[PDB]
Amino acid sequence: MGKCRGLRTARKLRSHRRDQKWHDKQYKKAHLGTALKANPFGGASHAKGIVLEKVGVEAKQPNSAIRKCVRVQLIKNGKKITAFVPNDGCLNFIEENDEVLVAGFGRKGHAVGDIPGVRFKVVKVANVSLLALYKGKKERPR
Amino acid sequence: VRMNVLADALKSINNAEKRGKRQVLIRPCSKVIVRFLTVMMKHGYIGEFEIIDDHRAGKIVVNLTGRLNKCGVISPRFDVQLKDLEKWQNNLLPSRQFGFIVLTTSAGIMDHEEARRKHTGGKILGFFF
Amino acid sequence: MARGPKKHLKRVAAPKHWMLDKLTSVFAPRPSTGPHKLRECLPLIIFLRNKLKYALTGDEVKKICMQRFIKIDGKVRADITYPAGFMDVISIDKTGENFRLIYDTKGRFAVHRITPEEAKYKLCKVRKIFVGTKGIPHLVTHDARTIRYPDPLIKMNDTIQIDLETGKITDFIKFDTGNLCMVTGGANLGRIGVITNRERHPGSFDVVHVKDANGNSFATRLSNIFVIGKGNKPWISLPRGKGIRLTIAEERDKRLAAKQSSG
Amino acid sequence: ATIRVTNLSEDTRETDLQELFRPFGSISRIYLAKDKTTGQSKGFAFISFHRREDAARAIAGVSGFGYDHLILNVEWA
Amino acid sequence: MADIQTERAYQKQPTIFQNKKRVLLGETGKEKLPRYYKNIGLGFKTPKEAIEGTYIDKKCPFTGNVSIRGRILSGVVTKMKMQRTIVIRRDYLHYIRKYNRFEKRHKNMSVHLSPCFRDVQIGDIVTVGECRPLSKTVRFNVLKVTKAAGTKKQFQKF
RNA sequence: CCUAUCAACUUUCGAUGGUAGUCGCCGUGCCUACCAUGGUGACCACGGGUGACGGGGAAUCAGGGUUCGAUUCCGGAGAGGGAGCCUGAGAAACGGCUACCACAUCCAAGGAAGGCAGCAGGCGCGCAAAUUACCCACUCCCGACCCGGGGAGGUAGUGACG
RNA sequence: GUGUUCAAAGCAGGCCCGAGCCGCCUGGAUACCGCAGCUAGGAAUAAUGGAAUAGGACCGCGGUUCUAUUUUGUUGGUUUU
RNA sequence: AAGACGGUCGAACUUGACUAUCUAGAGGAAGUAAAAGUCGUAACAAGGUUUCCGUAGGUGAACCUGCGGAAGGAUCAUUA
């Protein structure tokens, strides 16, 4: 347990709780604004960028595959980020300087899967939805 | 030394009762202890007590019974305006069908059923059931 | 900013007891400047076309007023949003009907027809009784009517029959214990009753213990008590809803019993 | 204001500059001198910022910063 | 009490002035013209000190033109330093519902001390009353300096 | 609201107070003479930070709590930034003025006129947000007035916030 | 409280008379207020109160001196009370 | 009426100083990930020199040693 509980000790409880709140990792990163400064999501939810280059990534063990990512510089945030390209044989439709809409993954602020330095995934290629291309609802216009 | 006297008495009885022991020596002995014991006694939770008189501060020998399950202390005391009584009663008692919250009101140290009728609140001492 | 006073008032920010709607209109009538304060007032329009329903446009309301068939307090008005108040009499000269405004204990302004005998005068409580300039005395009523040379024995919280034919004092009623009062505003809105005791406290705020007709006892501030005449001697009748005090259960029983039993 | 950029490549177009000059605030427009008779991107550009602070920040940083293996030169227009 | 010729300007009270009439010389008062005193009500009585006075203070509500209206507060004198002002520390309770105990809080307030109160010291309980702002910090004025048990020098033998 | 990797702070260009005056719609170190040496802090002052307007209110929580509040209503504040002013009971006013500063416009080169954080619309910005429409008939506001004027406000259009 | 067809909501409504009944009538409750302040009842609980080399109570009383105004019509002086 | 005396409010400008925020940068030295390569064998069973602390110095490196500790050692146990 281990706390004060007199008849005037309101002030002591009020401030002690506030002081200890800051320790927690989940709390601290968000409240010091670190999340915005380091990662492009936190203070945004989606972000559009221009494709710098298409990268092949010879995925770190465990799991033997070529993961295949794109490198994107986001227009709003101004940060260079490597983002996973999901869906099967869908790397193809990306082109250098053809944009993409990037969004976070699912861990939030930290790397996913077997691959470090990637914590984001592509959602639209050519701003017209990678999903729609994969299904074949829509065609690649570019 | 002792910054509450209720808390020591209540524990003393419970620890006796666990053993099956039918005596305790509680002290320092105060007016509030007497009053708490009488209300407790009336409902049958404990047996009769006898106050021995000294010029130190007094000592009480309580002959207890195992009709009690727990006498808790609400230390530090809180205000109860008859709309935190309900919150306490659901929280810290096993049913609303039995058990008493015992408070001190300006109309006397009384069980909370009597408090509800008077509509006089005060400070919460403890409870039992 | 804020460079001067507003000339508008929005609806859904107007006082409840005028009995306007919620958001179905975005502007309330707003009282004009006059003898009473805007909180306690009842703009002429709300009485004329929302209670007595003689207009279904605002265009009509202006046209009604210009006929000058409406006198308010014996004097000829033409203001579209006249700031009428407590015991102000409205005189329709085309139909011969005199209506006065007095609170229900529900808290809604009553449509309360009175005879033209009772519309000759109204009882106004003194607010100040003033030794004016060059040693001439005056009384000043709540509704900001200054009457010179008033009766020379009067004192504060007296009531005063003002006459509306001719102006001036037309006798007075002395303030004494057990006088009839209507307690106006607050949680004691529209209740009638005697006095009992007026408790005096030096410095601001003095409370007046009132006992109503039913026998429910309560205090309010002196400010919230309005003296409406002499004890057990009304000069205008009780309004609808008792005008005394009624419980929500009793009120429900009346509402269901009277409805589908008329016609 | 308006800032001039020089030592652009013919593989560096308006789009390549657009993402480059966003950490120095948002550009209003990027005009780039092109001639299609000879080459593509001549060598000079004119970036127009909306705000005076953002424009000056660009000139300071970008001059000495490498982009496509060349030292970009930026200066007040 | 203290003279008003101590400064560099002689003062008078309103509508108290010299008629020296036909007879030679004064006034030239023998107490610097009749000392006018008046009550302030609300369970306070003008003391001897007002009547005895002739002081150049006029922030006193028993000889001045200041009016006392509003809240009447009490405090303990935390500091007396320089003339005609004291500092009182006003203890109050700030209510906390969120924690189930609540906390004392205080403020120090500079308050005028009239020369209608003398034989005063630090630790004294004092009753102050609201007034129009006399000076930038000081909104209040000492109406009565009480002595009062819990303070003692009340067990005596002289 | 957060902060001690902010512990002493406030006046030489008043900091607090006394006295007297100038001044102001009026109180008051408001300002000034003279005279005092005050005032404030571990009960967090002082300093720094702040997508820090405030409230009524909103979302979720057994209870306790936690989180939200520019945003249909109320108060305050500003109308490119600063400073000054006129009219008037009320304005330090951008659909008033005057200067400067930053922006923009016309020019015959001497000059001259300007402020959409009003309604629509456009550009820029971005992940993000609609008609360059119709009407004073309603609801109210203003005026010399029922009569007129109102991007107040109503009306449609856009609208898988929900 | 109220029959928006249910409902989100809204503050409405319901009857009688052929349409001269020149008509009758119910409503738009009540509840909530960080605090502090104001009023008032209680006196438990937690603090708080005093008489020690004496002090508080009851016109208990005296000798001494002072000042204010009633009053002996009025106004002044002296002397008391 | 221009103009004009002296003052007050005072935008702005000019020269030094200051702090915060942002950004270029040859180079230097760390930690992390990054994985199956190169040199030892340090701790893990007493790891074949039990481990580790404070502190000082030394060893290419793990690490070793002196001086005082601890057992979380391999000793809860040594004597007429």
Short mmCIF file of N, CA and C in Angstrom, two decimals, chain C residues 17-134:
data_model
loop_
_atom_site.label_atom_id
_atom_site.label_comp_id
_atom_site.label_asym_id
_atom_site.label_seq_id
_atom_site.Cartn_x
_atom_site.Cartn_y
_atom_site.Cartn_z
N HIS C 17 -40.16 31.44 -18.02
CA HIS C 17 -41.51 31.71 -17.58
C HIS C 17 -42.32 32.58 -18.52
N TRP C 18 -41.75 32.95 -19.69
CA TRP C 18 -42.46 33.66 -20.73
C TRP C 18 -43.24 32.67 -21.56
N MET C 19 -42.83 31.38 -21.49
CA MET C 19 -43.42 30.25 -22.16
C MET C 19 -43.31 30.36 -23.66
N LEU C 20 -42.07 30.59 -24.14
CA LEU C 20 -41.70 30.44 -25.53
C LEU C 20 -41.22 29.04 -25.76
N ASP C 21 -41.08 28.69 -27.06
CA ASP C 21 -40.63 27.41 -27.55
C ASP C 21 -39.13 27.28 -27.40
N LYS C 22 -38.60 26.07 -27.71
CA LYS C 22 -37.18 25.84 -27.88
C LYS C 22 -36.75 26.32 -29.25
N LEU C 23 -35.83 25.58 -29.92
CA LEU C 23 -35.28 25.96 -31.20
C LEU C 23 -36.22 25.52 -32.28
N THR C 24 -37.05 26.49 -32.72
CA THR C 24 -38.03 26.41 -33.77
C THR C 24 -38.17 27.84 -34.25
N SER C 25 -37.57 28.79 -33.49
CA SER C 25 -37.43 30.18 -33.83
C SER C 25 -36.12 30.53 -33.18
N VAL C 26 -35.34 31.42 -33.83
CA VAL C 26 -33.97 31.68 -33.45
C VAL C 26 -33.85 33.02 -32.76
N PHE C 27 -34.98 33.74 -32.58
CA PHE C 27 -34.98 35.05 -31.99
C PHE C 27 -36.23 35.15 -31.17
N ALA C 28 -36.08 35.73 -29.96
CA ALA C 28 -37.14 35.97 -29.03
C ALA C 28 -37.55 37.41 -29.20
N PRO C 29 -38.74 37.83 -28.78
CA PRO C 29 -39.22 39.20 -28.95
C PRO C 29 -38.37 40.26 -28.32
N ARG C 30 -37.83 40.02 -27.10
CA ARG C 30 -37.07 40.97 -26.30
C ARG C 30 -37.89 42.17 -25.85
N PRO C 31 -38.03 42.49 -24.55
CA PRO C 31 -38.76 43.66 -24.09
C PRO C 31 -38.09 44.94 -24.53
N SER C 32 -38.86 46.04 -24.66
CA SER C 32 -38.32 47.37 -24.83
C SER C 32 -37.88 47.87 -23.47
N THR C 33 -37.06 48.95 -23.43
CA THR C 33 -36.76 49.69 -22.23
C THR C 33 -38.04 50.28 -21.67
N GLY C 34 -38.18 50.32 -20.33
CA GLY C 34 -39.42 50.79 -19.77
C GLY C 34 -39.32 50.81 -18.28
N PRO C 35 -40.43 50.58 -17.57
CA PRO C 35 -40.49 50.77 -16.13
C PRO C 35 -40.05 49.54 -15.38
N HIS C 36 -39.89 48.37 -16.05
CA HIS C 36 -39.59 47.12 -15.39
C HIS C 36 -38.42 46.50 -16.08
N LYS C 37 -37.75 45.56 -15.37
CA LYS C 37 -36.53 44.92 -15.80
C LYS C 37 -36.90 43.74 -16.65
N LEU C 38 -36.02 43.39 -17.61
CA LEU C 38 -36.38 42.60 -18.77
C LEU C 38 -36.62 41.15 -18.46
N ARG C 39 -36.07 40.66 -17.31
CA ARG C 39 -36.20 39.30 -16.86
C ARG C 39 -37.64 38.98 -16.52
N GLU C 40 -38.32 39.93 -15.83
CA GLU C 40 -39.62 39.71 -15.23
C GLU C 40 -40.71 40.17 -16.17
N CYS C 41 -40.34 40.73 -17.35
CA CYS C 41 -41.28 41.30 -18.28
C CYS C 41 -41.91 40.23 -19.14
N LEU C 42 -42.94 40.65 -19.89
CA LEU C 42 -43.71 39.83 -20.78
C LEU C 42 -43.97 40.75 -21.94
N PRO C 43 -43.17 40.72 -23.02
CA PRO C 43 -43.43 41.44 -24.26
C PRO C 43 -44.83 41.24 -24.78
N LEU C 44 -45.54 42.36 -25.08
CA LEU C 44 -46.90 42.45 -25.58
C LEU C 44 -47.28 41.40 -26.59
N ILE C 45 -46.37 41.11 -27.55
CA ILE C 45 -46.51 40.15 -28.61
C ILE C 45 -46.84 38.75 -28.11
N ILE C 46 -46.10 38.23 -27.09
CA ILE C 46 -46.30 36.92 -26.51
C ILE C 46 -47.69 36.78 -25.92
N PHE C 47 -48.23 37.86 -25.33
CA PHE C 47 -49.56 37.85 -24.77
C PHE C 47 -50.58 37.85 -25.89
N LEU C 48 -50.45 38.80 -26.83
CA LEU C 48 -51.37 39.04 -27.91
C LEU C 48 -51.56 37.92 -28.91
N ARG C 49 -50.45 37.28 -29.39
CA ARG C 49 -50.53 36.27 -30.42
C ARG C 49 -50.08 34.88 -30.06
N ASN C 50 -49.56 34.63 -28.84
CA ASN C 50 -49.14 33.29 -28.46
C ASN C 50 -50.06 32.76 -27.39
N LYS C 51 -50.78 33.65 -26.66
CA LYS C 51 -51.71 33.23 -25.64
C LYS C 51 -53.11 33.53 -26.10
N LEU C 52 -53.35 34.73 -26.68
CA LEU C 52 -54.68 35.11 -27.13
C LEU C 52 -54.83 34.93 -28.61
N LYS C 53 -53.72 34.66 -29.34
CA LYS C 53 -53.69 34.16 -30.70
C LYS C 53 -54.50 34.95 -31.70
N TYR C 54 -54.17 36.26 -31.85
CA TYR C 54 -54.83 37.15 -32.78
C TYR C 54 -53.97 37.40 -33.99
N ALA C 55 -52.81 36.71 -34.11
CA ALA C 55 -51.92 36.92 -35.23
C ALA C 55 -51.21 35.63 -35.46
N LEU C 56 -50.86 35.37 -36.74
CA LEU C 56 -50.08 34.21 -37.13
C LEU C 56 -48.89 34.67 -37.93
N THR C 57 -48.68 36.00 -38.06
CA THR C 57 -47.47 36.56 -38.60
C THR C 57 -47.06 37.66 -37.66
N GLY C 58 -45.83 38.20 -37.87
CA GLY C 58 -45.35 39.41 -37.26
C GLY C 58 -45.87 40.64 -37.94
N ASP C 59 -46.24 40.53 -39.24
CA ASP C 59 -46.77 41.61 -40.05
C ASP C 59 -48.08 42.11 -39.48
N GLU C 60 -48.97 41.16 -39.08
CA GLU C 60 -50.21 41.41 -38.40
C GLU C 60 -50.04 42.12 -37.08
N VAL C 61 -49.05 41.70 -36.24
CA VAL C 61 -48.79 42.29 -34.93
C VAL C 61 -48.56 43.78 -35.01
N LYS C 62 -47.75 44.26 -35.99
CA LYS C 62 -47.53 45.68 -36.20
C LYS C 62 -48.79 46.42 -36.58
N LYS C 63 -49.63 45.80 -37.44
CA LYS C 63 -50.87 46.34 -37.94
C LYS C 63 -51.93 46.47 -36.87
N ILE C 64 -52.02 45.47 -35.95
CA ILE C 64 -52.83 45.47 -34.74
C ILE C 64 -52.51 46.67 -33.88
N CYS C 65 -51.21 46.91 -33.61
CA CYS C 65 -50.72 47.93 -32.71
C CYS C 65 -51.08 49.30 -33.22
N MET C 66 -50.93 49.54 -34.55
CA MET C 66 -51.21 50.82 -35.17
C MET C 66 -52.67 51.22 -35.13
N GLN C 67 -53.62 50.26 -34.91
CA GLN C 67 -55.04 50.54 -34.75
C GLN C 67 -55.29 51.38 -33.51
N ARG C 68 -54.36 51.27 -32.53
CA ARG C 68 -54.41 51.81 -31.19
C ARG C 68 -55.67 51.50 -30.44
N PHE C 69 -55.99 50.19 -30.35
CA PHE C 69 -57.20 49.70 -29.73
C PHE C 69 -56.79 49.18 -28.37
N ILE C 70 -55.48 49.29 -28.04
CA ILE C 70 -54.88 48.69 -26.88
C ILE C 70 -54.36 49.85 -26.08
N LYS C 71 -54.81 49.94 -24.81
CA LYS C 71 -54.27 50.81 -23.80
C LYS C 71 -53.64 49.88 -22.81
N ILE C 72 -52.50 50.29 -22.22
CA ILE C 72 -51.84 49.54 -21.18
C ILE C 72 -51.62 50.56 -20.11
N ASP C 73 -52.29 50.33 -18.95
CA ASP C 73 -52.28 51.15 -17.76
C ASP C 73 -53.04 52.43 -17.99
N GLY C 74 -54.14 52.34 -18.78
CA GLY C 74 -55.05 53.44 -19.03
C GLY C 74 -54.55 54.41 -20.07
N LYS C 75 -53.38 54.12 -20.69
CA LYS C 75 -52.66 55.06 -21.51
C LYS C 75 -52.37 54.33 -22.78
N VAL C 76 -52.15 55.06 -23.90
CA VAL C 76 -52.42 54.53 -25.22
C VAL C 76 -51.07 54.17 -25.76
N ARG C 77 -50.86 52.85 -25.95
CA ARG C 77 -49.61 52.30 -26.40
C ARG C 77 -49.77 51.77 -27.79
N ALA C 78 -48.62 51.51 -28.44
CA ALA C 78 -48.53 51.21 -29.85
C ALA C 78 -47.21 50.51 -30.05
N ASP C 79 -46.56 50.09 -28.93
CA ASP C 79 -45.27 49.45 -28.91
C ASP C 79 -45.52 47.98 -29.11
N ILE C 80 -44.71 47.34 -29.99
CA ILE C 80 -44.89 45.97 -30.40
C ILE C 80 -44.39 44.98 -29.38
N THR C 81 -43.54 45.42 -28.43
CA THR C 81 -42.87 44.56 -27.48
C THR C 81 -42.88 45.31 -26.17
N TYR C 82 -44.07 45.80 -25.75
CA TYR C 82 -44.24 46.63 -24.57
C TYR C 82 -43.80 45.86 -23.33
N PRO C 83 -43.01 46.42 -22.41
CA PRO C 83 -42.51 45.71 -21.25
C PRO C 83 -43.50 45.76 -20.12
N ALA C 84 -44.58 44.94 -20.19
CA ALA C 84 -45.55 44.82 -19.12
C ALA C 84 -44.95 43.96 -18.05
N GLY C 85 -45.48 44.05 -16.81
CA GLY C 85 -44.90 43.38 -15.68
C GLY C 85 -46.00 42.97 -14.75
N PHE C 86 -45.72 43.04 -13.43
CA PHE C 86 -46.55 42.46 -12.40
C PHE C 86 -47.62 43.46 -12.04
N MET C 87 -48.89 43.01 -12.14
CA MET C 87 -50.11 43.74 -11.93
C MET C 87 -50.27 44.90 -12.89
N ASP C 88 -49.74 44.76 -14.12
CA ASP C 88 -49.97 45.69 -15.20
C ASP C 88 -51.20 45.21 -15.89
N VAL C 89 -52.15 46.15 -16.13
CA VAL C 89 -53.43 45.85 -16.71
C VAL C 89 -53.40 46.29 -18.15
N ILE C 90 -53.97 45.42 -19.01
CA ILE C 90 -54.02 45.55 -20.44
C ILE C 90 -55.49 45.73 -20.66
N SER C 91 -55.86 46.72 -21.50
CA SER C 91 -57.22 47.16 -21.67
C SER C 91 -57.45 47.13 -23.14
N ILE C 92 -58.35 46.23 -23.58
CA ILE C 92 -58.75 46.13 -24.96
C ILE C 92 -60.04 46.89 -24.98
N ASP C 93 -60.08 47.93 -25.83
CA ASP C 93 -61.13 48.92 -25.84
C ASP C 93 -62.13 48.61 -26.92
N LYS C 94 -61.90 47.49 -27.66
CA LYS C 94 -62.68 47.15 -28.82
C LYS C 94 -63.65 46.06 -28.42
N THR C 95 -63.47 45.49 -27.20
CA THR C 95 -64.16 44.29 -26.78
C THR C 95 -64.54 44.47 -25.34
N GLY C 96 -63.86 45.39 -24.61
CA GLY C 96 -64.24 45.79 -23.28
C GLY C 96 -63.73 44.82 -22.25
N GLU C 97 -62.56 44.19 -22.53
CA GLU C 97 -62.02 43.11 -21.75
C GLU C 97 -60.73 43.60 -21.19
N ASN C 98 -60.55 43.43 -19.86
CA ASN C 98 -59.37 43.87 -19.16
C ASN C 98 -58.72 42.66 -18.58
N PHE C 99 -57.42 42.48 -18.86
CA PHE C 99 -56.64 41.34 -18.47
C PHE C 99 -55.53 41.88 -17.63
N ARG C 100 -55.14 41.14 -16.58
CA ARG C 100 -54.04 41.53 -15.74
C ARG C 100 -53.14 40.33 -15.68
N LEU C 101 -51.85 40.58 -15.39
CA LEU C 101 -50.82 39.57 -15.37
C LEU C 101 -50.44 39.34 -13.95
N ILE C 102 -50.58 38.08 -13.50
CA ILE C 102 -50.23 37.69 -12.16
C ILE C 102 -49.77 36.27 -12.33
N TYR C 103 -48.79 35.84 -11.51
CA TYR C 103 -48.16 34.55 -11.63
C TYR C 103 -49.08 33.44 -11.18
N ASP C 104 -49.08 32.32 -11.94
CA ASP C 104 -49.46 31.01 -11.44
C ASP C 104 -48.37 30.53 -10.52
N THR C 105 -48.73 29.63 -9.58
CA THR C 105 -47.79 28.94 -8.73
C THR C 105 -47.12 27.81 -9.49
N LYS C 106 -47.68 27.42 -10.67
CA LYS C 106 -46.97 26.70 -11.70
C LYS C 106 -45.77 27.47 -12.21
N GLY C 107 -45.94 28.80 -12.42
CA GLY C 107 -44.86 29.68 -12.80
C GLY C 107 -45.08 30.21 -14.18
N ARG C 108 -46.34 30.18 -14.67
CA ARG C 108 -46.68 30.65 -15.99
C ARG C 108 -47.57 31.85 -15.83
N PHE C 109 -47.33 32.92 -16.63
CA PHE C 109 -48.12 34.14 -16.65
C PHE C 109 -49.57 33.81 -16.91
N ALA C 110 -50.50 34.35 -16.09
CA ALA C 110 -51.88 33.99 -16.18
C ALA C 110 -52.61 34.97 -17.04
N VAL C 111 -53.59 34.43 -17.80
CA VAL C 111 -54.52 35.20 -18.58
C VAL C 111 -55.68 35.28 -17.63
N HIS C 112 -55.90 36.47 -17.04
CA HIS C 112 -56.73 36.61 -15.88
C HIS C 112 -57.57 37.82 -16.10
N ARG C 113 -58.79 37.61 -16.65
CA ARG C 113 -59.76 38.64 -16.91
C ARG C 113 -60.22 39.21 -15.59
N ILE C 114 -60.32 40.55 -15.51
CA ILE C 114 -60.82 41.24 -14.35
C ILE C 114 -61.85 42.20 -14.87
N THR C 115 -62.74 42.66 -13.96
CA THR C 115 -63.80 43.58 -14.27
C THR C 115 -63.20 44.96 -14.49
N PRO C 116 -63.86 45.90 -15.15
CA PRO C 116 -63.30 47.22 -15.41
C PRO C 116 -63.27 48.05 -14.15
N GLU C 117 -63.96 47.61 -13.07
CA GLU C 117 -63.91 48.18 -11.74
C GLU C 117 -62.56 47.95 -11.11
N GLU C 118 -62.00 46.73 -11.28
CA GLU C 118 -60.73 46.33 -10.71
C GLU C 118 -59.60 46.75 -11.61
N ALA C 119 -59.91 47.23 -12.84
CA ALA C 119 -58.93 47.69 -13.78
C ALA C 119 -58.79 49.19 -13.71
N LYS C 120 -59.56 49.86 -12.81
CA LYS C 120 -59.39 51.26 -12.49
C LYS C 120 -58.08 51.51 -11.80
N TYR C 121 -57.68 50.60 -10.88
CA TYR C 121 -56.52 50.80 -10.05
C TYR C 121 -55.75 49.53 -10.00
N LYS C 122 -54.49 49.63 -9.52
CA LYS C 122 -53.61 48.52 -9.27
C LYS C 122 -52.88 48.91 -8.02
N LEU C 123 -52.42 47.90 -7.24
CA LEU C 123 -51.72 48.13 -6.01
C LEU C 123 -50.26 47.97 -6.30
N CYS C 124 -49.49 49.02 -5.98
CA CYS C 124 -48.08 49.11 -6.27
C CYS C 124 -47.40 49.35 -4.96
N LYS C 125 -46.39 48.51 -4.65
CA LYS C 125 -45.57 48.65 -3.47
C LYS C 125 -44.52 49.69 -3.71
N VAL C 126 -44.30 50.58 -2.70
CA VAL C 126 -43.26 51.59 -2.69
C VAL C 126 -41.91 50.93 -2.68
N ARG C 127 -40.99 51.47 -3.50
CA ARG C 127 -39.64 50.99 -3.59
C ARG C 127 -38.76 51.91 -2.81
N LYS C 128 -38.99 53.23 -2.98
CA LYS C 128 -38.33 54.27 -2.24
C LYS C 128 -39.34 55.35 -1.99
N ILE C 129 -39.15 56.11 -0.89
CA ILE C 129 -40.00 57.23 -0.58
C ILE C 129 -39.00 58.27 -0.18
N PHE C 130 -39.02 59.34 -0.99
CA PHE C 130 -37.87 60.11 -1.37
C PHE C 130 -38.14 61.50 -0.90
N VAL C 131 -37.19 62.13 -0.16
CA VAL C 131 -37.27 63.56 0.06
C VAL C 131 -36.51 64.13 -1.11
N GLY C 132 -37.28 64.69 -2.06
CA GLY C 132 -36.80 65.31 -3.26
C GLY C 132 -36.38 66.72 -3.05
N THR C 133 -35.97 67.34 -4.18
CA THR C 133 -35.37 68.65 -4.25
C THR C 133 -36.35 69.71 -3.85
N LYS C 134 -35.82 70.73 -3.14
CA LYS C 134 -36.54 71.80 -2.49
C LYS C 134 -37.54 71.34 -1.46
#
